[PDB]
């Protein structure tokens, strides 16, 4: 077996889950257009009653130039003109823990 669920049983498992979730359905035939319209209006869902989206759409210069000029040949600050994650610190902590644990045996 190994795996918790072989693919071939996926359809049966989903069928049983759906049967459990929806135990009762509306299975009463109508007789004309008005009844169907009324039933559609009655059964509307809050989550499926939105509206269609909207179409997709598209003096200080001297100071900025002076700042840009003064920041010439700056290796790092020039490009910007920042989400720390502390990855090196965590790597150091992990390696220190591993080394100490190994030294525990010896």
């Amino acid at each position: 077996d190994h795996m918790e669920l072989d693919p071939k049983n996926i359809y049966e498992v989903e069928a049983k889950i759906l049967l459990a979730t929806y135990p009762k359905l509306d299975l009463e035939p109508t007789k004309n257009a008005e009844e169907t319209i009324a039933k559609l209006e009655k059964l509307a869902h809050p989550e499926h009653s939105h509206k269609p989206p909207e179409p997709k759409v598209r003096d200080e210069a001297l100071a900025a130039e002076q700042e840009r000029y003064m920041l010439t040949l700056d290796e790092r600050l020039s490009s910007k003109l920042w989400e720390p994650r502390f990855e090196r610190f965590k790597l150091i902590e992990n390696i220190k823990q591993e080394h100490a644990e190994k030294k525990e045996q010896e």
């Binding site: 669920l5 049983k16 889950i17 459990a20």
Partner: peptide
């Protein structure tokens, strides 16, 4: 067994245990 898998999944999800019409009809019947 499918029943065991279904039960496990369901537990993991916290599933607790007006007059013109009548006139025309009457004419068509007459």
């Amino acid at each position: 067994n499918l029943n065991q898998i279904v039960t496990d999944y369901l537990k993991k999800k916290g599933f607790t245990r007006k007059y013109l019409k009548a006139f025309l009809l009457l004419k068509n019947w007459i």
